[PDB]
Amino acid sequence: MEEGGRDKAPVQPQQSPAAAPGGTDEKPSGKERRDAGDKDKEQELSEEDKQLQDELEMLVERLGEKDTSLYRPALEELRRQIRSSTTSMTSVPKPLKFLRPHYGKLKEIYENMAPGENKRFAADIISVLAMTMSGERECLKYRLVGSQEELASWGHEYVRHLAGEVAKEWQELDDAEKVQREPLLTLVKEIVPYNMAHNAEHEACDLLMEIEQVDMLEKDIDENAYAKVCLYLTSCVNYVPEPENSALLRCALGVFRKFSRFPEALRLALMLNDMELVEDIFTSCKDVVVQKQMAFMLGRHGVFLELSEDVEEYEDLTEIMSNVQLNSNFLALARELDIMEPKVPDDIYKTHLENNRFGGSGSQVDSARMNLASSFVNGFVNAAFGQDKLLTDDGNKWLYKNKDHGMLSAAASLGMILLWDVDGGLTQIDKYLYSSEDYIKSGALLACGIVNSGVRNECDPALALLSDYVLHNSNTMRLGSIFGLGLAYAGSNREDVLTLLLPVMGDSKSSMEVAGVTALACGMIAVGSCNGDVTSTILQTIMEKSETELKDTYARWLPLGLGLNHLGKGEAIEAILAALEVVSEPFRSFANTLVDVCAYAGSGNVLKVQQLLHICSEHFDSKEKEEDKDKKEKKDKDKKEAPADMGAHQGVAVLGIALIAMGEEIGAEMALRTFGHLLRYGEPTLRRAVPLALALISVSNPRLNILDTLSKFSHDADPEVSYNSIFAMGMVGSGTNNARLAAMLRQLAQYHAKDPNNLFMVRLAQGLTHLGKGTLTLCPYHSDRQLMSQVAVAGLLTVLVSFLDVRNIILGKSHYVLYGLVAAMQPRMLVTFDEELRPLPVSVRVGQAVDVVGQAGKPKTITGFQTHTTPVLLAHGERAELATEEFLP
Amino acid sequence: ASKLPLVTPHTQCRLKLLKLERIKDYLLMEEEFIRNQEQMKPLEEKQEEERSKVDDLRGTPMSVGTLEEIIDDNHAIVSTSVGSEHYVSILSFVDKDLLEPGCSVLLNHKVHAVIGVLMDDTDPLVTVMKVEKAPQETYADIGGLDNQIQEIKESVELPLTHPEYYEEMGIKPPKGVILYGPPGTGKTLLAKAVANQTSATFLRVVGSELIQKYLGDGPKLVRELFRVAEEHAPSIVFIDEIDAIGTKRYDSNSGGEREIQRTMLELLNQLDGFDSRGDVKVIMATNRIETLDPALIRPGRIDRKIEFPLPDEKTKKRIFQIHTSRMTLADDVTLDDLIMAKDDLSGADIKAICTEAGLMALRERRMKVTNEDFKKSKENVLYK
Amino acid sequence: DVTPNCRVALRNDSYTLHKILPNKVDPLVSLMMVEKVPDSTYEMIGGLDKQIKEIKEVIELPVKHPELFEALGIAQPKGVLLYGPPGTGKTLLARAVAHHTDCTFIRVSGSELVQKFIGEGARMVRELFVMAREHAPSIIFMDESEVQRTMLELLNQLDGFEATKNIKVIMATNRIDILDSALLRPGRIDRKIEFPPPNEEARLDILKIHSRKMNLTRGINLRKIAE
Amino acid sequence: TYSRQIKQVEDDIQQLLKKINELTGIKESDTGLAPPALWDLAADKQTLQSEQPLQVARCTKIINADSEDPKYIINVKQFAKFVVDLSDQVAPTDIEEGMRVGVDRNKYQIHIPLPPKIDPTVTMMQVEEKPDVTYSDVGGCKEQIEKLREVVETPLLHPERFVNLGIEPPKGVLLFGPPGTGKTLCARAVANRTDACFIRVIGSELVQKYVGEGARMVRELFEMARTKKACLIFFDEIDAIGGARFDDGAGGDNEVQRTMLELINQLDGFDPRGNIKVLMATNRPDTLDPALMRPGRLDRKIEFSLPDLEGRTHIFKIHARSMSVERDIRFELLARLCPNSTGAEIRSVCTEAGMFAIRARRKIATEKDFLEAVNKVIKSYAKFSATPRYMTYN
Ligand SMILES: Nc1ncnc2c1ncn2[C@@H]1O[C@H](COP(=O)(O)OP(=O)(O)OP(=O)(O)O)[C@@H](O)[C@H]1O
Ligand SMILES: Nc1ncnc2c1ncn2[C@@H]1O[C@H](COP(=O)(O)OP(=O)(O)OP(=O)(O)O)[C@@H](O)[C@H]1O
Ligand SMILES: Nc1ncnc2c1ncn2[C@@H]1O[C@H](COP(=O)(O)OP(=O)(O)O)[C@@H](O)[C@H]1O
Ligand SMILES: [Mg+2]
Ligand SMILES: [Mg+2]
């Protein structure tokens, strides 16, 4: 310990502040010149951020704190310069002069007067001087003042601009990663009124930098994936003009303001569609922005590009509508027939091979329900132009044999044979349509609504399925003619045929298998307005569901189209609109949780989760509302699909340990559909945790719950090595797990993963995380599998063709005007980069590099080389124009 | 445990805020999906009850068996400790994987069914041939060479520490490194500083101890040696004095020079096999570079050939300054007279003269070393 | 209380542990028991007094006083070569020094009954170092080319590669001009000590110490017998 | 601003990960147990079902049967020999003699036949896995690639052009030349391309300690080889497995010669390997025995020489395609400076020539960097050069 000798700072700043009450009165020169020699020496001796152990900042306040407490308040005649020498010296060490109750008394030194132009002694220093002190201001002082005292005195008025020049002081000194420290100031400052600080920093951000918008930009989109409802409401509309005013990157506008479409205002992204139709620059980014407006996240847009300039750029709309959809056809017409796919692969039933020699002999399984699964030897393999001529004979000779819903099934498989088609899908039905059969005609014409899905051209606004519907006095002519029109027009918001399908609800006909899927058909059309649909559902719900206490034909079908009619908003008005609408006995208050959480698909509002588990957790429920708790766990299946790769880990760490092992009914019977709505992504954290409850058949329960989780477990697309865990389970499934109720189900499980080698992107996360409907077409099946009385009769309308929004599979696409370039691509693991050094290292899977139409995969991001510069849209979106530029010799 | 590998950010980013609050989403939502288990069906504890149900399946007489084959439908032929093998079945708590032919397993006492697997206490030979700690000081101990230090850092250290320079170049490091010169020139002494420098697993073998007395035990020792070398990770294998396999004949080896030859065939495979080799660097040293097989010295098996010349006199004085650093040198001595004492003295000669001179001081209990200690020290060391 | 490499009592019905069986052997106590070296002392040294002082400087000092070499900043010696004709006191000297400084006098001979306590095959010689670092203040001794390669294989480990100290080697042989030049590297060997045949003075005292256990007759004139 | 507030919200939720994952049960780091959720198949049913009804059924070996009766003669590991009987679950057809069978401990009767012993050191030398070496990487010896590939895979991939012409294709080939010439690397393209069992054999792995021990490994090799339909057996460095027979005075080097003669007998005569193709690769062929060198065992005889000029230039284009270079360099000048050079030497010129660019501060090498590689690799290492007493193969 070497003390003494060089003690000038523990002596003369120990003497002259002690002689400062002895030199304030009756000594006018020593009051100000020793305060000047105290000010500039504490300034210059604390500007450097290498000597943080200053010789005054932790040394003078052993007596200079009590001297300051009798120096600034107890003087009472403070003039105009001695406050500039006093409050500029006494305000610097005060976050470390005081201990942790500084937060109520930052103001007894500073709010006397802010001395002049405070950044003058905060130019070189980064954060020791007054930026940590300013975080202490905006942490506590502006929170207590601006809790209900926003429009106020000096505590807000100068604090706006003091929160302006310090926020520019973050982008003034070094341009390090302390740039992203500024939305901490803009955020913790006025958390709910975020617009008043983003107006103070938006134009300063416009004059900030043109390269320092991108890490702050993704910094703001991450924050804008979810928040509290007002924070996500305000910070997302403040997110929008940053690539518009400062930057002109301007091509990620549509897919990243689908974020900002539903919660804020449905006309706001229509004004941003106007902002798409203003920047009329050219052809490339103009093409690529409106590529996604048809069949990548939304539809219902094809009446807004018929202005007075219809030559090619406003004649883009038909090419958006069907010709790049014909490029989605051209994928499988030209680019999948050359890679692997033959006309009849057929060999997954051939992959069911060696059970005749696995343990003796075979030729034993002769179950009649096996041919329901042998319908998909035709059906599931024939996606992506699997057209068959005299190879549909497994549906032809079974089409005329038995199984009336199998006559609906083999005739309904033809739409899965001809998918995304308008060219001949009406012609391939007509050779098997004419049979004078209620079940063949309604399944085949139900497949007519499947073929034109996404086309929405002139196929049948009131042409074919209206002619199918007007025949009705009976079975599926009445039923399977409203499903395909909602399926094909699921992307449309046309009101007229919605009012053609409104008397289907208002008929009050006793065909309840039709009246339940009527709500599932009209719910797929609109997600916003038209309260008359909701009135039409609830009036028949009162006329029918009230005077009965019976099965889930009502519960699985009628409020689900109301959830689809009020999907996607966190405003918590629709829960008041629909929860107080069906005030009733609790079996009609089954619909309390439908519209409440169906509006809450992707957000973070965990206060919804505590009111999603804490009202009805167990209560031991002696056979009263087990279905209402199955639906209460069904609405725990969102908050789970669109948060994107974040917090999904212990989604699986305990989703075997919460209900499926030692619940009562909700997990042993229902809650493995949390894995059936969560993902198809594919990872062993659930993929090796589910056969510990699936290979455990546990036959003491109603074992078709576990067999209901069998095919659903096999719900996962992007085909993998799961033929072990499913073909072994079907190998024991020959002897045990009786084929009298499961022969459709095990090969339904096996044939589901590898439908076709491709087209496996149905999982509601596009670009990075945006939705793309994907829920209106997927939800009523996982709601529909109440695990009974629909594996044989009623649910064969849904179990075939429920989800049909398959936006194909890959992103390897050139789309130059000639279509002569192939690519320069390099597929990798999902993005690592947030912020680091210079060109931030993007990701780490450099070993793969492609140039052609090849596969997508689950966690992949794809970049390039060759100085092509990929200048189109810069984030994601799978149809880059791919122009090139070579100003780099 | 391997929950989320996104640990990039390195500032106050909101991604870091929202991602850790979304781990708080998977943990708050699903800690409320942890509460309900023993609330609804207690029925056991499941922390020890099912565990003691396994432990009541398996008996306390746990016989230790050995695998030799696997049939997939949880039964296989396992070897007893006697030798009389059985055809027992395999349980469900056996985690069907850590099962290789030759693995130590746990069987029943009654029906000898495959209860468990056993962690292997390895073999002592790995601990024998494996260097544990850093031997000595750094490259600053060496002095005077300064050229091939860049060569050994070039071929070994720089590929390890900087995996960027070869990738911006589109190139791979050179494979084999060989060291040759007069004896006592610091050939092993460089590998000492390498074993200081690296963080990779380091193995060292003398070329004399390759040879054996039984037939094929040499090449088998080679095969398990490179097995041990590969089965870890990034590794450095050092071979000292590999001429001794070809120079000296011993009567312990039953096979003649055409057993040494076949050992050289096996090693000649193990340098450049068709197999995927891995991250195993090879550093070799000898003094009779002219004697051994040039088929092993070809580029592809050894890429870098490094000669060590004799120390020049200006480097000699540096080596004197090294080995006389921390000693109480009396000012009687003149090192320049000690330089030209031998015209071709090695670096070991300097250190030997220094240590023996210290021995001459400790014969007389002094603290400093005088000139006559060196005068009779060069007579003792050099002239005999 | 359960030690590795220890016997136990066991019950037979359930194979429950009963009681710890006392002890058995070290794998080195049996080894030197098989070898049976003639234990010696200073009190049976016949006239080798300067050689005693030479061997104390190499062996005795870096046990009792290792800091004394860090007072000079030099490394401690490791290897001893004893040479001269047979029958000159090499074995009793090397046994004696370890006996007085309390080290594990472990000679190696390359036999095969020694083999079973070192290992099952012991493909190297280096597996002895397991027992050697377990008896860490130890001294390895060697007789008069398998010894010559063996010593090099030891010295290559204890060149800086073995970190455990207090392990030193002694080779005893004759005719130094026919051994290895790599063993004649000047930095390799730390000290070589010659043992001459005894003169008339040193033939007398071995008769003196050796004459102790005999029942004599008064008046012998041992000087004439030594002459 | 929320500097500690992001840190403690990080750490309490990363800790609360452990605070509930200990409540799940993955803990109690075992001595060979399963994870505690994994095993629940054998929880209540198979605990008393795969244990209590189930036997041990100790496996045995059949000596022979007899006529008119089952009356089997069994054999076990150490114990005595019994007259045993079938079960009712199996036919007496595949209870053929010299066969392992599972046998109960009390009645001592046969339950199920077993596959024979493979001696798993012979199992380990099946490759199970393929390298990535393409025939494009073996450029410079294209006619040798064709003359080899017409023998290796063309009857295997097309067994109709030879049968319908009426010829039986050859089964044997040796590959020989100087070291580093691309023989082993050339075989890596074969193990890349092919599809059947690729069982590799290195000649220094068969040298055993006992007498005749290695010859039985040849036997088990060809026994598991004849079980398969088609197989490719690779031989490397066959000078270790045999040169010739030269024995004079005291018997020296006898043991390897018996394994070599066993390999001869397993190659020709007495209902041959059938569909088993062999492929040798050696360094010096002059040492080899002529009865081994007889066609019918070693039909194709591929030499690997040095390239003339253009194969060398192609090798420059192989190893120099994927490295940052000056654009306007020429490789033909480099090939004129290497009259006698192997492809590994050319690769060392390239890989050193990039290190010259790594020497000072350059991202792409130059022509003079190549010239700095040529004089060092070619002319400064020219003391060793490894070739000239192997051109004559001595
Ligand atoms: N250039 C040098 N500078 C300083 N000390 C050296 C030098 N060369 C050798 N020495 C010393 O001499 C001793 C012997 O050196 P080293 O073991 O490297 O010789 P070598 O050539 O490896 O012998 P061999 O390879 O035949 O065993 C080392 O302990 C080292 O301290
Ligand atoms: N024609 C060639 N083209 C490119 N590289 C070659 C060529 N010939 C040899 N090489 C290089 O030689 C190296 C080793 O080849 P290989 O192991 O096949 O030699 P070999 O002829 O089998 O002799 P040895 O049996 O001694 O190894 C390979 O890494 C390869 O890069
Ligand atoms: N100085 C001595 N005093 C007494 N006995 C000695 C002396 N030197 C040698 N001997 C005798 O020689 C024997 C030891 O021989 P020694 O030379 O140590 O073995 P080696 O011949 O293997 O070197 C002892 O039994 C001892 O009687
Ligand atoms: Mg050395
Ligand atoms: Mg080779």
Swiss-Prot record, chain A:
GO terms for biological process: proteasome-mediated ubiquitin-dependent protein catabolic process; regulation of protein catabolic process. Keywords: Acetylation, Phosphoprotein, Proteasome, Repeat. Residues 708-889 are annotated as: Required for interaction with UBLCP1. Found in skeletal muscle, liver, heart, brain, kidney, pancreas, lung and placenta. The modification Phosphothreonine is found at T24. Residues 10-21 have a biased composition (Low complexity). The modification N-acetylmethionine is found at M1. One of its GO terms (molecular function) is enzyme regulator activity. InterPro entries: 26S_Psome_Rpn1, ARM-like, ARM-type_fold, Proteasome/cyclosome_rpt, RPN1_C, RPN1_N. The keyword Phosphoprotein applies. GO terms for cellular component: cytosol; extracellular exosome; extracellular region; ficolin-1-rich granule lumen; membrane; nucleoplasm; nucleus; proteasome accessory complex. Residues 1-52, 623-645 are annotated as: Disordered. The modification Phosphotyrosine is found at Y194. The modification N6-acetyllysine is found at K551. It comes from the Eukaryota. PC repeats lie at residues 409-442, 443-479, 480-514, 517-551, 560-589, 692-723, 742-757. Residues 24-52, 623-643 have a biased composition (Basic and acidic residues). SUPFAM superfamilies: ARM repeat (SSF48371). The modification Phosphoserine is found at S16, S29, S147, S361, S363. Component of the 26S proteasome, a multiprotein complex involved in the ATP-dependent degradation of ubiquitinated proteins. This complex plays a key role in the maintenance of protein homeostasis by removing misfolded or damaged proteins, which could impair cellular functions, and by removing proteins whose functions are no longer required. Therefore, the proteasome participates in numerous cellular processes, including cell cycle progression, apoptosis, or DNA damage repair. Belongs to the proteasome subunit S2 family. Component of the 19S proteasome regulatory particle complex. The 26S proteasome consists of a 20S core particle (CP) and two 19S regulatory subunits (RP). The regulatory particle is made of a lid composed of 9 subunits, a base containing 6 ATPases and few additional components including PSMD2. Interacts with RPGRIP1L. Interacts with CRY1 in a KDM8-dependent manner. This is 26S proteasome non-ATPase regulatory subunit 2. It comes from Homo sapiens (Human). The gene is PSMD2.
From Swiss-Prot, chain B:
Disulfide bonds: none annotated. It is a lipid-anchor. Residues 41-58 have a biased composition (Basic and acidic residues). GO terms for molecular function: ATP binding; ATP hydrolysis activity; proteasome-activating activity; RNA binding. ATP binds at G181, P182, P183, G184, T185, G186, K187, T188. There is a cross-link at K192 (Glycyl lysine isopeptide (Lys-Gly) (interchain with G-Cter in ubiquitin)). GO terms for cellular component: cytosol; membrane; nucleoplasm; nucleus; proteasome accessory complex; proteasome complex; proteasome regulatory particle, base subcomplex. GO terms for biological process: proteasome-mediated ubiquitin-dependent protein catabolic process. SMART domains: AAA. The modification N6-acetyllysine is found at K213. CDD domains: RecA-like_PAN_like. It comes from the Eukaryota. It is linked to Birk-Aharoni syndrome: An autosomal recessive disorder characterized by failure to thrive, severe developmental delay, intellectual disability, spastic tetraplegia with central hypotonia, chorea, hearing loss, micropenis and undescended testes, as well as mild elevation of liver enzymes. This is 26S proteasome regulatory subunit 4. It comes from Homo sapiens. The gene is PSMC1.
UniProtKB/Swiss-Prot annotation, chain D:
The keyword Flavoprotein does not apply. GO terms for biological process: osteoblast differentiation; positive regulation of proteasomal protein catabolic process; proteasome-mediated ubiquitin-dependent protein catabolic process; ubiquitin-dependent protein catabolic process. SUPFAM superfamilies: P-loop containing nucleoside triphosphate hydrolases. The keyword Nucleotide-binding applies. SMART domains: AAA. Component of the 19S proteasome regulatory particle complex. The 26S proteasome consists of a 20S core particle (CP) and two 19S regulatory subunits (RP). The regulatory particle is made of a lid composed of 9 subunits, a base containing 6 ATPases including PSMC2 and few additional components. Interacts with NDC80/HEC; this interaction is detected only during M phase. Interacts and SQSTM1. Interacts with PAAF1. Directly interacts with TRIM5. (Microbial infection) Interacts with HIV-1 Tat. It holds the Pfam family AAA. One of its GO terms (molecular function) is proteasome-activating activity. The modification N6-acetyllysine is found at K77, K383. ATP binds at G177, P178, P179, G180, T181, G182, K183, T184. One of its GO terms (cellular component) is proteasome accessory complex. Transmembrane segments: none annotated. Belongs to the AAA ATPase family. Its main location: cytoplasm. Induction: Expression is not cell cycle-dependent and occurs throughout the cell cycle. Keywords: Acetylation, ATP-binding, Cytoplasm, Nucleotide-binding, Phosphoprotein, Proteasome, Ubl conjugation. It comes from Homo sapiens (Human). It is found in: Cytoplasm. Component of the 26S proteasome, a multiprotein complex involved in the ATP-dependent degradation of ubiquitinated proteins. This complex plays a key role in the maintenance of protein homeostasis by removing misfolded or damaged proteins, which could impair cellular functions, and by removing proteins whose functions are no longer required. Therefore, the proteasome participates in numerous cellular processes, including cell cycle progression, apoptosis, or DNA damage repair. This is 26S proteasome regulatory subunit 7.
